[PDB]
Design a protein around this ligand. Sequence first.
Ligand SMILES: *C(=O)[C@H]([C@@H](C)O)[C@H]1CC(SCCNC=N)=C(C(=O)O)N1
Length: 263
Amino acid sequence: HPETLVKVKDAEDQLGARVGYIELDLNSGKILESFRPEERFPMMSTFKVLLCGAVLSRIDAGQEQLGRRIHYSQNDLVEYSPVTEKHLTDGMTVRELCSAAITMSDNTAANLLLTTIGGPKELTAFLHNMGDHVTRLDRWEPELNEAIPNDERDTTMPVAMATTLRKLLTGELLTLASRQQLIDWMEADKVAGPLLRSALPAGWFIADKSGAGERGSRGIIAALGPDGKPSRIVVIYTTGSQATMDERNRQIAEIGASLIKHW
Ligand SMILES: *C(=O)[C@H]([C@@H](C)O)[C@H]1CC(SCCNC=N)=C(C(=O)O)N1
């Protein structure tokens, strides 16, 4: 609905920076509304859902196991690793690393998982192979969050990310058990409270993943819908703003309230 575009465009103006938005029908793939849909924005932590999608694809192909254990050390820890910092002694399983990477904000977990698939080049190849010729991962954590103006490294486009998420969650890309595992991790997200979740009505389902990087970069990807089932995908990205985190959170929350009101 155009009234939500009023909010999206007001956010761009209030934040003094680009805002990318897309609302997609989960079942049909129809783009219901968009703003700068084909412009590039830094993925930040939102790439982690695609990373676990690549890990699950390997699990489905017999190349990886959810219970496989990975041992790491102090040397491997990078900034923002609150889950991985606590398991230096006995390590963590692949399933536990994806949980940490998606549900919490843990950079080392993502780096450990990236290593398992062969690095950023392989995540990018996985995406290219499933039809997403836009989304690309180039670096590891935490450098991938640099958000250099005009840099295409580690970016996606709102439309590319939304249609890729649709394919991962409901397409034949992943088995039914793997599809559900990915969406269960997203549903369990614990660090996106002040964003779309703050506008979600009672009884509604939400599975998401937020991210924040350098230079004001902030975003969220989500599958949400009424009566406990997701029916639409929402992708919101922004980069370049000097505004406070709270201000950026509020704008995303208000876009969410508008899309919910006009559902
Ligand atoms: C993704 O989960 C990132 C990071 C761990 O790669 C986290 C960091 C933050 S907030 C901390 C940094 N502030 C902004 N630069 C978020 C978040 O979505 O709040 N994602």
